[PDB]
C-alpha cells in the first residue's frame, strides 16, 4: 500500500 503521503 503506497501511503497517501
Amino acid at each position, epitope marked *: 500500500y*503506497e*501511503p*497517501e*503521503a
Partner: antibody, heavy 122, light 113 residues
Framework: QEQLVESGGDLVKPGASLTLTCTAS?????????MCWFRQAPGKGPEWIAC????????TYYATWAKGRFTISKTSSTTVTLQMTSLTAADTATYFC??????????????WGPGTLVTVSS | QVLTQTASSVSAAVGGTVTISCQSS????????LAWYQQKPGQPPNLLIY???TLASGVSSRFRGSGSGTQFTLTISGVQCDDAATYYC?????????????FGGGTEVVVKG
C-alpha cells in the same frame, strides 16, 4: 552508512538529452518512501521535478512543467534515473536526488545527495 | 501548490532574532507536513525542522518552527554567524492529487557581526 550520489550531470547541447542517475548505498528500495529529484538553478532555490514510489507500485509523479520532457524510472534496487529531453539553457542547474519519507518518518528517512551539475550549452 | 516566503533577505545582530514566514497556497498534508531547510553554497538542503515544529536530530534548539495549515514561521533566536545561509520551507502534499513536495523560494539571513 545510508547515502545517495547523483551522477551523469554534464555539459550538453540545447535540444539534446541527458540521463542522470541517483545511486543508493547502505540500503535498497523497499517501501514506505519515494525517491525524488529536485533541481536548483544558479542563484535560485530548489524546485521539485518528480518522485517514484520505492515500493511495488513504482508510481511516478511529475511537476506540471516537467511531465513532457522528464522521465523518472527505477533501474535497479539501488538506482533511479532522470531522463531529460529537449534541453535548453533554462535546464542548467544542480540536480539533487532525495529520499521522501512517508508521513510519520519524514525526518527518519530524509536523505540528500551532494547534487550533479547539468550545463546546457552549445 | 505554491509556497511563498518572507522576502529574499532578513538581518539580525549576533544574539538577536530572525523571523522567516512561509505561506502555502493550499493546506499542507494534515496541516503539519512542512519542513525547514538551511542551505549554504555548494551543499544540498540541510533539514532543520520537519512536521512543522519538530527539530531534526542534532539541530540547535534556537531554531523554532511554528504554524499550521497554510501559514508557518521559522524563528532563529540567538543568531550566530554560522546561521548566515538561505532558508527554505518545503511543503508536503499527496502525490496523487498535487505536487509531492513544494519548496518556497528562499529567505537569506544576513548576520551583523
Amino acid at each position: 552508512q545510508e547515502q545517495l550520489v547523483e551522477s551523469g550531470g554534464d555539459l550538453v547541447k540545447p535540444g539534446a538529452s541527458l540521463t542522470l542517475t541517483c545511486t543508493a548505498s547502505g540500503f535498497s528500495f523497499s517501501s514506505n518512501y519515494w525517491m525524488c529529484w529536485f533541481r536548483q538553478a544558479p542563484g535560485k532555490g530548489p524546485e521539485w521535478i518528480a518522485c517514484i514510489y520505492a515500493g511495488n507500485s513504482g508510481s511516478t509523479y511529475y511537476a506540471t512543467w516537467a511531465k513532457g520532457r522528464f522521465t523518472i524510472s527505477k533501474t535497479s534496487s539501488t538506482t533511479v534515473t532522470l531522463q531529460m529531453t529537449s534541453l535548453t539553457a533554462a535546464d542548467t542547474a544542480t540536480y539533487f536526488c532525495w529520499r521522501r519519507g512517508a508521513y510519520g518518518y519524514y525526518g527518519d528517512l530524509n536523505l540528500w545527495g551532494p547534487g550533479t551539475l547539468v550545463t546546457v550549452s552549445s | 501548490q505554491v509556497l511563498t516566503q518572507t522576502a529574499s533577505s532578513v538581518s539580525a545582530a549576533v544574539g538577536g532574532t530572525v523571523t522567516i514566514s512561509c505561506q502555502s497556497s493550499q493546506s499542507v498534508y494534515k496541516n503539519n507536513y512542512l519542513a525547514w531547510y538551511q542551505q549554504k553554497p555548494g551543499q544540498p538542503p540541510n533539514l532543520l525542522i520537519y512536521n512543522a515544529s519538530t527539530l531534526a536530530s542534532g539541530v540547535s534548539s534556537r531554531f523554532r518552527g511554528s504554524g499550521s495549515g497554510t501559514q508557518f514561521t521559522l524563528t532563529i533566536s540567538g543568531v550566530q554567524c554560522d546561521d548566515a545561509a538561505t532558508y527554505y520551507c518545503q511543503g508536503g502534499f499527496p502525490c496523487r492529487t498535487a505536487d509531492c513536495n513544494v519548496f518556497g523560494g528562499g529567505t537569506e539571513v544576513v548576520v551583523k557581526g
